[PDB]
Design an enzyme around this catalytic site. Structure first.
Site, short mmCIF file in Angstrom:
data_model
loop_
_atom_site.label_atom_id
_atom_site.label_comp_id
_atom_site.label_asym_id
_atom_site.label_seq_id
_atom_site.Cartn_x
_atom_site.Cartn_y
_atom_site.Cartn_z
N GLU A 1 -7.20 0.46 -4.27
CA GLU A 1 -7.37 0.47 -2.83
C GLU A 1 -8.74 0.03 -2.30
O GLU A 1 -8.81 -0.83 -1.43
CB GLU A 1 -6.98 1.87 -2.32
CG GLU A 1 -5.50 2.14 -2.64
CD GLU A 1 -5.08 3.60 -2.64
OE1 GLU A 1 -3.90 3.84 -3.00
OE2 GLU A 1 -5.89 4.49 -2.30
N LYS B 1 3.07 11.35 -4.05
CA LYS B 1 2.03 10.68 -4.71
C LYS B 1 1.00 11.59 -5.41
O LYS B 1 0.44 11.11 -6.35
CB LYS B 1 1.32 9.73 -3.81
CG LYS B 1 0.17 8.96 -4.33
CD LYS B 1 -0.10 7.76 -3.57
CE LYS B 1 -1.53 7.26 -3.93
NZ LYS B 1 -1.96 6.29 -2.93
N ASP C 1 -12.84 6.05 2.96
CA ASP C 1 -11.39 6.12 3.14
C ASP C 1 -10.87 7.51 3.48
O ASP C 1 -10.77 8.38 2.61
CB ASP C 1 -10.72 5.64 1.84
CG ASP C 1 -9.22 5.39 2.00
OD1 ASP C 1 -8.54 6.12 2.76
OD2 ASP C 1 -8.73 4.46 1.32
N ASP D 1 0.90 -1.14 0.00
CA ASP D 1 0.00 0.00 0.00
C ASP D 1 0.95 1.21 0.00
O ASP D 1 1.49 1.57 1.04
CB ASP D 1 -0.87 0.00 1.26
CG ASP D 1 -1.56 1.34 1.50
OD1 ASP D 1 -2.32 1.44 2.49
OD2 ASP D 1 -1.34 2.30 0.74
N1 LIG Z 1 -5.38 6.66 16.46
C1 LIG Z 1 -5.53 7.59 15.52
N2 LIG Z 1 -6.46 8.53 15.66
C2 LIG Z 1 -6.66 9.42 14.75
N3 LIG Z 1 -5.88 9.41 13.65
C3 LIG Z 1 -4.93 8.52 13.37
C4 LIG Z 1 -4.67 7.50 14.32
N4 LIG Z 1 -3.62 6.73 13.83
C5 LIG Z 1 -3.20 7.31 12.66
N5 LIG Z 1 -4.01 8.34 12.38
C6 LIG Z 1 -3.96 9.26 11.21
O1 LIG Z 1 -4.15 8.50 10.03
C7 LIG Z 1 -3.46 9.27 9.01
C8 LIG Z 1 -2.68 8.32 8.16
O2 LIG Z 1 -3.65 7.64 7.49
P1 LIG Z 1 -3.28 6.33 6.66
O3 LIG Z 1 -4.42 5.45 6.25
O4 LIG Z 1 -2.16 5.77 7.48
O5 LIG Z 1 -2.48 7.09 5.46
P2 LIG Z 1 -2.49 7.36 3.85
O6 LIG Z 1 -3.20 8.61 3.45
O7 LIG Z 1 -1.06 7.35 3.51
O8 LIG Z 1 -2.96 6.10 3.28
C9 LIG Z 1 -2.50 10.21 9.73
O9 LIG Z 1 -3.01 11.51 9.63
C10 LIG Z 1 -2.54 9.76 11.13
O10 LIG Z 1 -2.23 10.87 11.98
MG LIG Z 2 -4.68 4.82 1.94
#
Ligand SMILES: Nc1ncnc2c1ncn2[C@@H]1O[C@H](COP(=O)(O)OP(=O)(O)O)[C@@H](O)[C@H]1O
Ligand SMILES: [Mg+2]
Length: 504
Positions: free
Chosen positions: A145, A68, A167, A8
């Site tokens: 995704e 990205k 998402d 991912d």
């Molecule tokens: N426990 C949590 N509570 C709220 N937000 C979270 C938590 N854990 C991670 N995040 C937030 O999720 C976001 C990352 O999302 P993710 O699905 O990992 O990323 P991406 O956009 O790369 O796919 C970050 O902003 C992170 O701060």
């Molecule tokens: Mg993602």
């Protein structure tokens, strides 16, 4: 041969999973975390990636964040007079992930399934297929995704249905409506906001903080990179803690300084205050959900399942908002930070699990049987039956008062015993006198794994039996086997032999 890791490659974070055993495993990176920041820093000529690069994103001017957003574009980033394409920076991240997957596997990984947004165009895809190749990976498949997430829940193993995946990541918001039809997914609708994510929930906190400081000391911390980096890191750490706790401490000692010396920023932030500051962000999330329903010609009632993806989906207020909007309880069963990579590793295992190898198997070369009243051949074990095999048929007496039955075992394909090969003969004697067709003789053919057949005749009422190992010089082999195999369909139709209804 290599495993196909599931990757991912996200805007904010990246995650890699693999199928080992019969379970999908998310691979921890060098410092023990399952997701690593999708950021690259060029500090001192050494390419830094992951947390080490993110820790200095505000502080360092050449640090590449969310590259990205560029992918599939002729955008170029320049570090010290040198240009890099998004494919190239994506490759560096890529190389990191591949590397630590090798550490974890203790072997080389040279194949992968890379994930991309359902709305990526040809340019966008190709740019990430190319990134995989630069990194030394054979990209076996580019899946989207939303679908990868559905795969992680094993939805493709169920009944046809409509799914809504919500998402919310670090930088973008996507909603996709997937319709499962006979084990295959189809994207009916897509909508989102590519500037709505956890980073923005962060940005509310940072802003609330620097303002309290701006009004309490007249100093604007957002003007000091080192102070800002400390703020960014602390605003994110506090947001996360507020997902499982209602109160938290943002503690930043020696944050700044004035005429009287060091200034410290200390303050407790509650869930309520955080939710208040970010309520507008949560509402901006509803529009795309509705537009996607409109595009698909659906209503919340047509959605059988709502799936959550993205770390920001862990925010209590966010889950309550879609719960209320759709009137359905969201599925969070699999880790929303890893769900996409997990679905990619399942697809990888499926690709890697394809076997096309043939296995030899012994089968009966010709139909085996016994002669029956009127010169007719009665088969017990058909041609091309897998050995070992064992078949039993019950036969009876033809005339009133038989004592004895002659078991004539034959091998062939034609209806009349006279046209087949004689394999042997034996007789069962001592059958108690009875009317015709009353006594029960069970004859069983038993073939062992070596192709040798053993015939037994057993009087079921008496339990007296006779048998022989029909036996090789066993008669036929090469030619003869095919010569008869043809000739039986050839001369077909003394199958007229049903003239043998010499009736009763
Ligand atoms: N426990 C949590 N509570 C709220 N937000 C979270 C938590 N854990 C991670 N995040 C937030 O999720 C976001 C990352 O999302 P993710 O699905 O990992 O990323 P991406 O956009 O790369 O796919 C970050 O902003 C992170 O701060
Ligand atoms: Mg993602």
């Amino acid at each position: 041969m290599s495993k196909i890791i599931g990757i991912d490659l996200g805007t904010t974070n990246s995650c890699v999973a693999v199928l080992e055993g019969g379970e999908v495993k998310v691979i921890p990176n060098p410092e023990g975390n399952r997701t690593t920041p999708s950021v690259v820093a060029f500090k001192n000529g050494e390419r830094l990636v992951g947390e080490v690069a993110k820790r200095q994103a505000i502080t360092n001017p050449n640090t590449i964040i969310s590259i990205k957003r560029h992918m599939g574009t002729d955008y170029k980033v320049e570090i010290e007079g040198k240009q890099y394409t998004p494919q190239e920076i994506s490759a560096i991240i890529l190389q990191y992930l591949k590397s630590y997957a090798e550490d974890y596997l203790g072997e080389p990984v040279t194949r992968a399934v890379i994930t991309v947004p359902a709305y990526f165009n040809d340019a966008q895809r190709q740019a990430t297929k190319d990134a995989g190749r630069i990194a030394g990976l054979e990209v076996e498949r580019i899946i989207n995704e939303p679908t990868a997430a559905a795969l992680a829940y094993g939805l493709d193993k169920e009944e046809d249905q409509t799914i809504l995946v919500y998402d919310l990541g670090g930088g973008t918001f996507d909603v996709s409506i997937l319709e499962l039809g006979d084990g295959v997914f189809e994207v009916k609708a897509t909508a989102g906001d590519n500037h709505l994510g956890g980073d923005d929930f962060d940005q509310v906190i940072i802003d609330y903080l620097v303002n309290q400081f701006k009004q309490e000391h007249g100093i604007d911390l957002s003007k000091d990179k080192m102070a800002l980096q400390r703020l960014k890191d602390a605003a994110e750490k506090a947001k996360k803690e507020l997902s499982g706790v209602t109160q938290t401490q943002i503690s930043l000692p020696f944050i700044s300084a004035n005429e009287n010396g060091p200034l410290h920023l200390e303050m407790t932030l509650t869930r309520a205050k955080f939710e208040e500051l970010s309520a507008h962000l949560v509402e901006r999330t509803m529009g795309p959900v509705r537009q996607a329903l409109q595009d698909a010609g659906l209503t919340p009632a047509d959605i059988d399942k709502v799936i959550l993806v993205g770390g920001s989906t862990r925010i209590p207020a966010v889950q309550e908002a879609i719960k209320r909007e759709l009137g359905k309880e969201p599925h969070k069963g699999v880790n929303p930070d890893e769900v996409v990579a997990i679905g990619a590793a399942i697809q990888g295992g499926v690709i890697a699990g394809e076997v096309k190898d043939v296995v030899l198997l012994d089968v009966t070369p010709l139909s085996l049987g016994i002669e029956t009243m009127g010169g007719v051949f009665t088969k017990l074990i058909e041609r091309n039956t897998t050995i070992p095999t064992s078949k039993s048929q019950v036969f009876t007496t033809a005339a009133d008062n038989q004592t004895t039955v002659d078991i004539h075992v034959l091998q062939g394909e034609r209806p009349m015993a006279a046209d087949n090969k004689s394999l042997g003969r034996f007789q069962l004697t001592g059958i108690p006198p009875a009317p015709r067709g009353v006594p029960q003789i069970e004859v069983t053919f038993d073939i062992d794994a070596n192709g040798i057949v053993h015939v037994r005749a057993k009087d079921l009422g008496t339990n007296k039996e006779q048998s022989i190992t029909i036996k090789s010089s066993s008669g036929l082999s090469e030619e003869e086997i095919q010569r008869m195999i043809k000739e039986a369909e050839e001369n077909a139709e003394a199958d007229r032999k049903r003239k043998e209804a010499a009736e009763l």
